[PDB]
Amino acid sequence: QQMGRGSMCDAFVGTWKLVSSENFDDYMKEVGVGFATRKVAGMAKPNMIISVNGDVITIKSESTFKNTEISFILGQEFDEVTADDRKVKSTITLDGGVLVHVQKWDGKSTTIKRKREDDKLVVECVMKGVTSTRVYERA
């Protein structure tokens, strides 16, 4: 083995903690999340751990609502069971330094964008005209 090189995706790597959320209940309603799940999911302040190993990116979410972990290769579709229990087909790509995560299920689609802004990692969740913005800081 040799030491590999870095990548632009290294700006995302680390341990992150949710510090603010805007419009998440309305986003979840648009997605179709039911009342009790929205209430409990909306309280969570997850930690998100992003790591890279070769071509494989892993995003882990640790919370009191539901732990999740996805590992993927950019551009390559995978199966994902979301925190709210949707079974979706996901594809994650880079667009000009933004990680763009599209989830497809039941003829619906939602896009989650993750971007570095100053020392933060901003997560924008979009479902048909409804956006939620979630801001993470380094843990």
Name the binding residues for a fatty acid: 134-136
> CB of residue 63 vs ligand FBZ: minimum separation in angstroms?
9
Q: Rule CB under 6 A: which residues touch ligand FBZ?
A: 28, 61, 82-84, 112, 123, 125, 134
Q: 97 phi and psi, to 5 degrees?
A: 80, -10
Smallest CA-to-CA distance from 121 within 100, 136, 139 is with 136
**Between 7 and 68, CB nearer to ligand FBZ:** 68
> CB of residue 68 vs ligand FBZ: minimum separation in angstroms?
7
* DSSP codes, 71-98: EE-TT--EEEE-TT--EEEEEEEEETTE
User: What is the C-alpha separation between 80 and 85, in angstroms, rounded?
Assistant: 9
Query: 70 by DSSP, 3-state: which?
Result: strand
Binding-site residues: 134-136
**Between 6 and 35, CB nearer to ligand FBZ:** 35
> CB of residue 109 vs ligand FBZ: minimum separation in angstroms?
14
